[PDB]
From a paper:
CK2 is a protein kinase overexpressed in cancer cells and a validated oncology target; CX4945, a traditional small molecule ATP-binding site inhibitor of CK2, is currently undergoing clinical studies. Among the strategies designed to target CK2 outside its orthosteric binding site, is the inhibition of the PPI between the α and the β subunits. Disruption of the holoenzyme assembly affects the function of CK2 by preventing phosphorylation of β-dependent substrates, the shuttling of the protein between different intracellular compartments, and by reducing the stability of the catalytic α subunit.30–33 With the exception of the Phe pocket, the CK2α/β interface is a shallow and hydrophobic surface; consequently, peptides are an ideal class of molecule to target this PPI. In order to design stable peptides targeting the CK2α/β interaction, we used a rational-design approach based on the valuable crystal structures of CK2β and the disulfide bridged Pc peptide.
Therefore, the sequence of P1 was modified to replace Ile9 with a larger, non-polar Trp to create peptide P2 (Ac-GXRLYGFKWHXGG-NH2 where X = Fmoc-Aza-OH). The resulting peptide was macrocyclised using C4 as a linker to afford P2-C4. The constrained P2-C4 peptide showed also a 300-fold improvement compared to the linear variant P2 (Kd 44 μM). Therefore, the increased binding affinity of P2-C4 for CK2α may be explained with a reduced entropic penalty upon binding due to the rigidifying interaction occurring between the constraint and the Trp residue. As one of the key roles of CK2β is to recruit substrates to the kinase, the effect of PPI inhibition on substrate phosphorylation was studied using CK2β dependent and independent substrates. It was shown that P2-C4 was able to inhibit the phosphorylation of a CK2β-dependent substrate – the transcription factor eIF2β – with an IC50 of 206 ± 29 nM. The assay indicates that P2-C4 can disrupt, in a dose-dependent manner, the CK2 holoenzyme thereby reducing the ability of CK2α to phosphorylate CK2β-dependent substrates. As expected, P2-C4 did not affect the phosphorylation of a β-independent substrate peptide (RRRADDSDDDD) meaning that binding at the interface site does not displace the ATP or significantly alter the kinase activity allosterically (ESI Fig. S3†).
Author numbering:
A (entry chain C): 2 to 14
B (entry chain A): 3 to 329
Amino acid sequence: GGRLYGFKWHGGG
Amino acid sequence: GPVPSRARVYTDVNTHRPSEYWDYESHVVEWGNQDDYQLVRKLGRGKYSEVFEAINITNNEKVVVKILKPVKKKKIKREIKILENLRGGPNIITLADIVKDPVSRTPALVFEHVNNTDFKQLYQTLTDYDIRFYMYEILKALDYCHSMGIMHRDVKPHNVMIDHEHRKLRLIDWGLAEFYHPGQEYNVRVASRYFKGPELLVDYQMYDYSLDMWSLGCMLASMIFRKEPFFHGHDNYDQLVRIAKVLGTEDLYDYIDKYNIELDPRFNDILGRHSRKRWERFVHSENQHLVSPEALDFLDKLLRYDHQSRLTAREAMEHPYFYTVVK
Ligand SMILES: *Cn1cc(-c2cc(C(=O)O)cc(-c3cn(C*)nn3)c2)nn1
Protein backbone atom coordinates (compact mmCIF):
# COMPACT_ATOMS: atom_id res chain seq x y z
CA GLY A 1 0.00 0.00 0.00
CA GLY A 2 3.02 2.30 -0.24
CA ARG A 3 3.97 2.76 -3.86
CA LEU A 4 5.02 5.63 -6.14
CA TYR A 5 3.86 5.02 -9.74
CA GLY A 6 3.58 1.37 -8.65
CA PHE A 7 7.11 0.98 -7.28
CA LYS A 8 7.81 -0.10 -3.70
CA TRP A 9 10.70 1.59 -1.83
CA HIS A 10 14.07 0.27 -0.55
CA GLY A 11 15.27 2.83 2.32
CA GLY A 12 17.68 2.69 5.19
CA GLY A 13 21.02 0.94 5.05
CA GLY B 1 9.56 28.64 -50.01
CA PRO B 2 12.79 27.64 -48.16
CA VAL B 3 15.66 26.02 -50.12
CA PRO B 4 16.15 22.29 -49.30
CA SER B 5 19.25 21.06 -47.40
CA ARG B 6 20.84 17.65 -46.79
CA ALA B 7 23.33 16.49 -44.15
CA ARG B 8 26.90 16.47 -45.63
CA VAL B 9 27.56 13.15 -43.86
CA TYR B 10 25.63 9.96 -42.93
CA THR B 11 22.98 11.27 -45.33
CA ASP B 12 21.23 8.05 -46.40
CA VAL B 13 21.96 5.80 -43.39
CA ASN B 14 18.27 5.15 -42.62
CA THR B 15 17.39 4.35 -46.31
CA HIS B 16 19.78 1.40 -46.05
CA ARG B 17 18.19 0.07 -42.85
CA PRO B 18 14.92 -1.93 -42.58
CA SER B 19 11.79 -0.11 -41.41
CA GLU B 20 12.04 -2.06 -38.06
CA TYR B 21 15.10 0.19 -37.33
CA TRP B 22 13.50 3.66 -37.70
CA ASP B 23 9.69 3.00 -37.67
CA TYR B 24 9.31 3.52 -33.94
CA GLU B 25 5.47 3.78 -34.11
CA SER B 26 5.41 0.06 -35.14
CA HIS B 27 7.81 -1.00 -32.34
CA VAL B 28 6.51 -3.69 -29.97
CA VAL B 29 7.78 -2.73 -26.48
CA GLU B 30 9.32 -5.61 -24.47
CA TRP B 31 8.03 -4.97 -20.90
CA GLY B 32 9.89 -6.29 -17.88
CA ASN B 33 8.61 -6.90 -14.35
CA GLN B 34 8.04 -3.65 -12.37
CA ASP B 35 8.38 -5.54 -9.02
CA ASP B 36 12.08 -6.23 -9.84
CA TYR B 37 12.74 -2.53 -9.00
CA GLN B 38 12.45 -0.42 -5.87
CA LEU B 39 12.98 3.36 -5.51
CA VAL B 40 15.78 4.61 -3.20
CA ARG B 41 15.83 8.45 -3.52
CA LYS B 42 14.55 11.14 -5.97
CA LEU B 43 17.34 12.62 -8.20
CA GLY B 44 15.27 15.24 -10.09
CA ARG B 45 12.17 16.15 -12.12
CA GLY B 46 12.14 17.04 -15.82
CA LYS B 47 9.37 18.88 -17.71
CA TYR B 48 7.81 15.48 -18.63
CA SER B 49 9.73 12.92 -16.40
CA GLU B 50 10.85 12.07 -12.78
CA VAL B 51 14.26 10.46 -12.11
CA PHE B 52 15.14 8.13 -9.18
CA GLU B 53 18.09 6.26 -7.78
CA ALA B 54 16.77 2.69 -7.52
CA ILE B 55 17.72 -0.93 -6.89
CA ASN B 56 17.11 -4.16 -8.83
CA ILE B 57 16.07 -6.50 -5.92
CA THR B 58 16.64 -9.70 -8.03
CA ASN B 59 20.48 -9.14 -7.97
CA ASN B 60 21.04 -6.00 -5.71
CA GLU B 61 22.35 -3.98 -8.73
CA LYS B 62 22.03 -0.15 -8.47
CA VAL B 63 19.99 1.36 -11.36
CA VAL B 64 18.35 4.69 -12.36
CA VAL B 65 14.55 4.79 -12.94
CA LYS B 66 13.07 7.49 -15.18
CA ILE B 67 9.28 7.68 -14.76
CA LEU B 68 7.66 9.18 -17.86
CA LYS B 69 4.84 11.69 -17.38
CA PRO B 70 2.00 11.69 -20.02
CA VAL B 71 3.63 14.05 -22.63
CA LYS B 72 6.91 11.94 -22.59
CA LYS B 73 4.96 8.65 -22.34
CA LYS B 74 3.29 9.53 -25.70
CA LYS B 75 6.71 9.52 -27.53
CA ILE B 76 8.10 6.62 -25.43
CA LYS B 77 8.39 4.31 -28.45
CA ARG B 78 10.76 6.78 -30.14
CA GLU B 79 12.97 7.13 -27.07
CA ILE B 80 12.96 3.31 -26.53
CA LYS B 81 13.79 2.55 -30.18
CA ILE B 82 16.64 5.08 -30.23
CA LEU B 83 18.04 3.81 -26.91
CA GLU B 84 17.90 0.18 -28.13
CA ASN B 85 19.48 1.05 -31.52
CA LEU B 86 22.34 2.93 -29.86
CA ARG B 87 22.84 0.53 -26.95
CA GLY B 88 26.49 -0.48 -26.57
CA GLY B 89 27.75 2.57 -28.51
CA PRO B 90 30.59 4.70 -27.07
CA ASN B 91 29.49 6.87 -24.09
CA ILE B 92 25.78 6.12 -24.81
CA ILE B 93 23.61 5.55 -21.66
CA THR B 94 22.57 1.85 -21.45
CA LEU B 95 18.81 1.07 -21.20
CA ALA B 96 18.55 -1.99 -18.88
CA ASP B 97 14.74 -2.47 -18.67
CA ILE B 98 11.33 -0.96 -19.52
CA VAL B 99 8.43 -1.36 -17.04
CA LYS B 100 4.89 -0.08 -16.51
CA ASP B 101 2.65 0.36 -13.48
CA PRO B 102 -0.31 -2.09 -14.07
CA VAL B 103 -2.56 0.32 -12.08
CA SER B 104 -1.80 3.90 -13.39
CA ARG B 105 -0.28 2.57 -16.68
CA THR B 106 2.66 4.99 -16.07
CA PRO B 107 5.74 3.66 -17.98
CA ALA B 108 9.34 3.87 -16.70
CA LEU B 109 12.77 3.41 -18.31
CA VAL B 110 15.44 1.58 -16.22
CA PHE B 111 19.06 2.59 -17.00
CA GLU B 112 22.58 1.42 -16.05
CA HIS B 113 23.66 3.07 -12.78
CA VAL B 114 25.52 6.37 -13.45
CA ASN B 115 26.92 8.61 -10.66
CA ASN B 116 24.42 11.51 -10.07
CA THR B 117 26.82 14.32 -11.23
CA ASP B 118 26.09 16.25 -14.47
CA PHE B 119 28.70 18.08 -16.65
CA LYS B 120 27.35 21.50 -15.45
CA GLN B 121 28.44 20.73 -11.82
CA LEU B 122 32.14 20.34 -12.90
CA TYR B 123 32.58 21.87 -16.42
CA GLN B 124 33.27 25.31 -14.85
CA THR B 125 36.20 23.91 -12.68
CA LEU B 126 38.14 21.65 -15.15
CA THR B 127 41.73 22.02 -16.37
CA ASP B 128 42.51 22.73 -20.06
CA TYR B 129 43.28 18.97 -20.57
CA ASP B 130 40.02 17.85 -18.91
CA ILE B 131 37.90 20.14 -21.15
CA ARG B 132 39.56 18.57 -24.22
CA PHE B 133 39.18 15.07 -22.78
CA TYR B 134 35.46 15.32 -21.97
CA MET B 135 34.70 17.19 -25.26
CA TYR B 136 36.33 14.21 -27.10
CA GLU B 137 34.23 11.70 -25.13
CA ILE B 138 31.01 13.63 -26.07
CA LEU B 139 32.19 13.69 -29.73
CA LYS B 140 32.56 9.88 -29.70
CA ALA B 141 28.87 9.60 -28.66
CA LEU B 142 27.70 12.15 -31.27
CA ASP B 143 29.67 10.65 -34.15
CA TYR B 144 28.22 7.27 -33.16
CA CYS B 145 24.59 8.37 -32.97
CA HIS B 146 24.89 10.45 -36.17
CA SER B 147 26.48 7.44 -37.95
CA MET B 148 23.40 5.46 -36.71
CA GLY B 149 21.04 7.95 -38.38
CA ILE B 150 19.98 9.75 -35.18
CA MET B 151 20.16 13.43 -34.08
CA HIS B 152 20.19 13.93 -30.25
CA ARG B 153 18.59 17.47 -30.53
CA ASP B 154 19.10 18.30 -26.79
CA VAL B 155 22.91 18.50 -26.28
CA LYS B 156 23.57 20.52 -23.06
CA PRO B 157 25.58 20.15 -19.78
CA HIS B 158 22.61 18.67 -17.86
CA ASN B 159 22.40 15.85 -20.46
CA VAL B 160 26.04 14.77 -19.96
CA MET B 161 26.59 12.56 -16.85
CA ILE B 162 30.25 12.37 -15.67
CA ASP B 163 31.90 10.18 -13.03
CA HIS B 164 34.97 12.47 -12.76
CA GLU B 165 36.94 10.07 -10.53
CA HIS B 166 36.55 7.30 -13.10
CA ARG B 167 36.94 9.73 -16.12
CA LYS B 168 33.69 8.27 -17.49
CA LEU B 169 31.00 10.19 -19.44
CA ARG B 170 27.50 9.18 -20.70
CA LEU B 171 25.19 11.12 -23.09
CA ILE B 172 21.68 10.88 -21.60
CA ASP B 173 18.06 12.02 -22.18
CA TRP B 174 17.29 10.79 -25.65
CA GLY B 175 13.62 11.90 -25.24
CA LEU B 176 14.00 14.62 -27.93
CA ALA B 177 16.12 12.48 -30.30
CA GLU B 178 14.88 11.74 -33.83
CA PHE B 179 15.84 9.71 -36.91
CA TYR B 180 17.38 11.73 -39.74
CA HIS B 181 15.71 11.24 -43.16
CA PRO B 182 17.02 13.47 -45.99
CA GLY B 183 14.61 16.24 -46.95
CA GLN B 184 12.42 15.75 -43.87
CA GLU B 185 11.04 18.92 -42.25
CA TYR B 186 11.38 18.65 -38.47
CA ASN B 187 9.81 20.45 -35.51
CA VAL B 188 12.06 23.39 -34.50
CA ARG B 189 10.78 23.24 -30.89
CA VAL B 190 13.83 21.19 -29.79
CA ALA B 191 16.97 21.87 -27.69
CA SER B 192 17.15 24.22 -24.67
CA ARG B 193 17.08 27.99 -25.30
CA TYR B 194 20.85 28.62 -24.77
CA PHE B 195 21.89 25.61 -26.97
CA LYS B 196 19.39 26.18 -29.82
CA GLY B 197 21.44 26.50 -33.03
CA PRO B 198 20.29 29.50 -35.53
CA GLU B 199 18.34 27.10 -37.80
CA LEU B 200 15.76 26.59 -34.97
CA LEU B 201 15.62 30.34 -34.11
CA VAL B 202 14.85 31.34 -37.74
CA ASP B 203 12.33 28.41 -38.14
CA TYR B 204 14.42 26.47 -40.70
CA GLN B 205 12.92 22.95 -40.53
CA MET B 206 15.20 20.96 -42.82
CA TYR B 207 18.00 20.65 -40.29
CA ASP B 208 20.20 17.65 -39.51
CA TYR B 209 22.93 16.21 -37.21
CA SER B 210 24.82 19.55 -37.47
CA LEU B 211 22.31 20.99 -34.96
CA ASP B 212 24.08 18.94 -32.22
CA MET B 213 27.39 20.49 -33.28
CA TRP B 214 26.13 24.04 -32.69
CA SER B 215 24.93 22.95 -29.19
CA LEU B 216 28.34 21.35 -28.52
CA GLY B 217 30.04 24.63 -29.57
CA CYS B 218 27.84 26.52 -27.04
CA MET B 219 29.09 24.13 -24.31
CA LEU B 220 32.75 24.59 -25.37
CA ALA B 221 32.44 28.38 -25.39
CA SER B 222 30.95 28.35 -21.88
CA MET B 223 33.77 26.03 -20.66
CA ILE B 224 36.82 27.80 -22.15
CA PHE B 225 35.52 31.32 -21.39
CA ARG B 226 33.91 30.59 -17.98
CA LYS B 227 30.66 32.26 -19.14
CA GLU B 228 27.47 30.31 -18.37
CA PRO B 229 25.52 30.27 -20.67
CA PHE B 230 27.66 31.67 -23.47
CA PHE B 231 24.64 33.05 -25.46
CA HIS B 232 22.27 34.27 -22.74
CA GLY B 233 18.97 35.07 -24.48
CA HIS B 234 15.71 35.89 -22.62
CA ASP B 235 13.49 34.23 -25.27
CA ASN B 236 13.98 32.60 -28.72
CA TYR B 237 14.14 35.96 -30.50
CA ASP B 238 16.60 37.52 -28.07
CA GLN B 239 18.69 34.28 -28.27
CA LEU B 240 19.32 35.04 -32.00
CA VAL B 241 20.22 38.64 -31.08
CA ARG B 242 22.83 37.40 -28.54
CA ILE B 243 24.35 35.17 -31.25
CA ALA B 244 24.33 38.04 -33.82
CA LYS B 245 26.23 40.29 -31.35
CA VAL B 246 29.12 37.77 -31.55
CA LEU B 247 28.97 36.21 -35.04
CA GLY B 248 27.80 39.46 -36.63
CA THR B 249 24.77 40.17 -38.80
CA GLU B 250 26.47 40.08 -42.26
CA ASP B 251 26.90 36.29 -42.08
CA LEU B 252 23.34 35.90 -40.71
CA TYR B 253 21.78 37.66 -43.68
CA ASP B 254 24.03 35.62 -46.05
CA TYR B 255 22.71 32.43 -44.32
CA ILE B 256 19.05 33.53 -44.57
CA ASP B 257 19.54 34.38 -48.27
CA LYS B 258 21.29 31.04 -49.07
CA TYR B 259 18.39 28.95 -47.69
CA ASN B 260 15.63 31.45 -48.69
CA ILE B 261 14.50 31.65 -45.04
CA GLU B 262 11.64 34.00 -44.20
CA LEU B 263 12.94 36.02 -41.27
CA ASP B 264 10.12 36.72 -38.82
CA PRO B 265 9.40 40.53 -38.90
CA ARG B 266 9.72 40.61 -35.07
CA PHE B 267 13.49 40.50 -35.67
CA ASN B 268 13.36 43.88 -37.56
CA ASP B 269 13.49 46.15 -34.47
CA ILE B 270 15.68 43.85 -32.37
CA LEU B 271 18.51 42.30 -34.45
CA GLY B 272 20.21 45.55 -35.45
CA ARG B 273 23.55 45.43 -37.28
CA HIS B 274 26.67 44.07 -35.65
CA SER B 275 30.29 43.34 -36.54
CA ARG B 276 31.72 39.82 -36.15
CA LYS B 277 33.64 39.86 -32.82
CA ARG B 278 37.06 38.18 -32.62
CA TRP B 279 37.01 35.17 -30.23
CA GLU B 280 40.02 36.71 -28.38
CA ARG B 281 37.63 39.44 -27.08
CA PHE B 282 36.19 36.84 -24.62
CA VAL B 283 39.63 36.00 -23.14
CA HIS B 284 40.46 37.53 -19.71
CA SER B 285 42.82 36.86 -16.75
CA GLU B 286 40.36 34.30 -15.18
CA ASN B 287 39.96 32.07 -18.28
CA GLN B 288 43.24 32.57 -20.27
CA HIS B 289 44.64 29.21 -18.98
CA LEU B 290 41.78 27.34 -20.80
CA VAL B 291 42.26 29.22 -24.05
CA SER B 292 44.72 28.36 -26.83
CA PRO B 293 44.90 29.16 -30.59
CA GLU B 294 43.71 25.54 -31.22
CA ALA B 295 40.66 25.99 -28.86
CA LEU B 296 39.68 29.21 -30.66
CA ASP B 297 40.18 27.72 -34.13
CA PHE B 298 38.05 24.70 -33.14
CA LEU B 299 35.30 26.85 -31.54
CA ASP B 300 35.20 29.12 -34.63
CA LYS B 301 34.55 26.04 -36.83
CA LEU B 302 31.61 24.83 -34.70
CA LEU B 303 29.79 28.13 -34.11
CA ARG B 304 28.79 29.02 -37.69
CA TYR B 305 25.30 30.09 -38.78
CA ASP B 306 25.42 27.85 -41.85
CA HIS B 307 24.71 24.36 -40.50
CA GLN B 308 26.47 22.73 -43.48
CA SER B 309 29.61 24.78 -42.73
CA ARG B 310 30.10 23.42 -39.20
CA LEU B 311 32.55 20.63 -38.46
CA THR B 312 30.93 17.20 -38.24
CA ALA B 313 31.60 15.18 -35.06
CA ARG B 314 34.27 13.03 -36.81
CA GLU B 315 35.96 16.12 -38.40
CA ALA B 316 35.92 17.73 -34.91
CA MET B 317 37.64 14.56 -33.46
CA GLU B 318 40.47 15.12 -36.01
CA HIS B 319 41.10 18.76 -34.93
CA PRO B 320 44.54 19.64 -33.41
CA TYR B 321 42.77 20.77 -30.17
CA PHE B 322 42.46 17.06 -29.36
CA TYR B 323 46.07 16.00 -30.11
CA THR B 324 46.97 15.96 -26.41
CA VAL B 325 44.01 13.61 -25.57
CA VAL B 326 45.16 10.02 -24.84
CA LYS B 327 43.16 7.98 -27.42
C1 LIG C 1 3.86 2.42 1.03
N1 LIG C 1 4.76 3.56 0.88
C2 LIG C 1 6.09 3.59 0.98
C3 LIG C 1 6.43 4.90 0.84
C4 LIG C 1 7.76 5.52 0.91
C5 LIG C 1 7.96 6.83 0.51
C6 LIG C 1 9.23 7.40 0.59
C7 LIG C 1 9.43 8.81 0.22
O1 LIG C 1 10.63 9.21 0.36
O2 LIG C 1 8.53 9.52 -0.16
C8 LIG C 1 10.30 6.64 1.06
C9 LIG C 1 10.10 5.32 1.46
C10 LIG C 1 11.19 4.52 2.03
C11 LIG C 1 12.51 4.80 2.18
N2 LIG C 1 13.02 3.75 2.82
C12 LIG C 1 14.37 3.55 3.31
N3 LIG C 1 12.07 2.83 3.06
N4 LIG C 1 10.95 3.30 2.59
C13 LIG C 1 8.83 4.77 1.38
N5 LIG C 1 5.29 5.61 0.64
N6 LIG C 1 4.27 4.79 0.67
